[PDB]
Specification:
With 455 residues, the protein is of the alpha/beta class. It has helices spanning 43-52, 101-114, 129-143, 160-163, 172-189, 207-214, 238-242, 246-262, 286-301, 332-343; strands at residues 3-10, 17-18, 24-28, 57-61, 68-70, 97-99, 117-122, 148-153, 195-200, 220-226, 266-272, 307-310, 320-323, 327-330, 346-354, 362-369, 374-380, 387-392, 399-405, 416-417, 434-435, 439-444, 448-454. The protein has 10 helices and 23 strands. It comes from Acidobacterium capsulatum (strain ATCC 51196 / DSM 11244 / BCRC 80197 / JCM 7670 / NBRC 15755 / NCIMB 13165 / 161).
């Protein structure tokens, strides 16, 4: 029998307004070595991004940003034109790659087809300040100041020690000296260059001193989050993935404190479920759709300006998989982001769950859409409990529901939203949309999601 829970919506309990460019993706900078990938000719991938949002942000960076080198002198090679760069596993040095004027030009045409803005990684790990200034100048010339949200100087600098890029003694003081040298060089070439950083998780040895020192020099704080904790934690499981993560709550509170102290907003510029490219049987499963969609809302309710799910190639956690030659497909995590896209932007409202101790992993978020209509997003992350949700405080005459479904939490396929899979090039329309029975009652199966929209 289902667990009977109450949901009280309070249209006077205003939360944050979700911006229109909240959604986003993150890719490896190595992928720019292939000028066919982020290109105006890549209509398939452009289509998947448009489905995720009419506005959004493409972040290019990652571990490979330290191994990728701008050369204004270079043309793409034959092997460059077929390169597929999945998420870097971090075990060893990436291969050296080269980015060319042609790739940057094609990236501009890609962004023209999507409507998305760009965060672009520069090579602080192994590059020079002069070459970063030259790359920044070319990006600003080609992409333009309207679409270029920020440059990033270094990816995960707090892991440079441990990973070969700097010695074990590298600390914030050393990184600040590096950051200032790059910033100064770039701004001489590009006086309007925007920056974000420090591209780490919230922590005290790096991110708090960064914001204090560089607040007048950055547009916003860029933070990373992975659900998987330290390497010495028990192996990530779907069960663990569905539970609240105290570290996420604490890291988010820290970023909110920084915003209060410095005036700087924050964006989660690289996230996914499990690091080192993801974990087979967790990251590539329908559980990841529930995890992601819930995370999008949890961060929005905390005042995050946006998110960027890491991906590329055929990585276990990528939202979109594929290549220009073979075509692209939506993986299960995409469907959680699709629920958010279908819900749209607007202002968050109070939504309090009660009588839920037997179904403790159910989450719910209420939103007043830009168009005035109330939506509720529910993620029944309980793996063994169906629920029956008695909804009060919504005074609309009727509502409809689109279900986020798969037959098992560990399914790697068979994922649908609104009774339909996503097709080629991001094509999606709901095919099954049922009416919801100031007192609404919604049933949800275990390990499922729903988007309600009221008239």
């Amino acid at each position: 029998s289902p667990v009977r829970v109450g949901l009280s919506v309070d249209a006077s309990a205003l939360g944050h307004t979700i911006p229109p460019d909240y959604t986003g993706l993150s890719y490896e900078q190595a992928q720019m070595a292939n000028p066919n990938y982020f290109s105006g000719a890549n209509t398939q991938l452009a289509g998947f991004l448009r489905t995720l949002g009419r506005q959004g942000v493409l972040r290019i960076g990652g571990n490979t940003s330290e191994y990728t080198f701008w050369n204004r002198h270079a043309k793409p090679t034959a092997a460059d034109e077929h390169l597929a760069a999945g998420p870097d596993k971090g075990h060893h040095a990436a291969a050296r790659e080269v980015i060319t004027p042609e790739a940057v030009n094609n990236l501009s045409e890609f962004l023209d087809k999507t409507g998305w803005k760009l965060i672009y990684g520069l090579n602080l790990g192994k590059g020079t300040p002069e070459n970063a200034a030259d790359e920044a100048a070319y990006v600003m010339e080609t992409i333009g100041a309207d679409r270029l949200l920020a440059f990033q100087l270094g990816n995960e600098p707090d892991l440079f020690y441990r990973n070969g890029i700097r010695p074990a003694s590298y600390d914030f003081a050393a990184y600040a000296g590096d950051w200032q040298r790059f910033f100064t060089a770039i701004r001489k070439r590009v006086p309007n260059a925007p920056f974000a950083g420090p591209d780490t998780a919230y922590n005290t040895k790096w991110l708090v001193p960064f914001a204090d020192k560089f607040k007048h020099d950055v547009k916003f704080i860029s933070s990373h989050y992975y659900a998987e904790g330290p390497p010495t934690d028990p192996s990530m499981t779907i069960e663990r993935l569905m539970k609240p993560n105290p570290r996420l709550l604490g890291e988010t509170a820290g970023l909110k404190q920084v915003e209060a102290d410095t005036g700087l907003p924050f964006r989660l510029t690289e996230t996914n479920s499990c690091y080192q490219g993801g974990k087979q049987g967790v990251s590539d499963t329908f559980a990841a759709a529930l995890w992601a969609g819930d995370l999008m809302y949890q961060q929005a309710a905390a005042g995050s300006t946006g998110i960027n799910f890491h991906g590329g190639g055929y990585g276990w956690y990528t939202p979109v998989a594929g290549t220009p030659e073979d075509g692209f497909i939506a993986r299960p995590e995409y469907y959680g982001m699709l629920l958010f896209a279908q819900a749209g932007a607007g202002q968050l409202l109070g939504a309090k769950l009660t009588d839920n101790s037997a179904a403790p992993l159910l989450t719910a978020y209420a939103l007043r859409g830009t168009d005035g209509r109330t939506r509720i997003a529910l993620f029944n992350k309980n793996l063994d409990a169906d629920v029956e949700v008695a909804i009060s405080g919504v005074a609309s005459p009727s509502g409809t529901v689109l279900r986020l479904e798969a037959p098992r939490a560990d399914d790697t396929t068979d994922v649908t939203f609104g009774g339909a899979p996503v097709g080629a090039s991001g094509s999606w329309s709901p095919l099954v949309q049922e009416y919801v029975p100031g007192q609404f009652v919604l049933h949800m199966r275990k390990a499922s999601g729903a988007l309600l929209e009221f008239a």
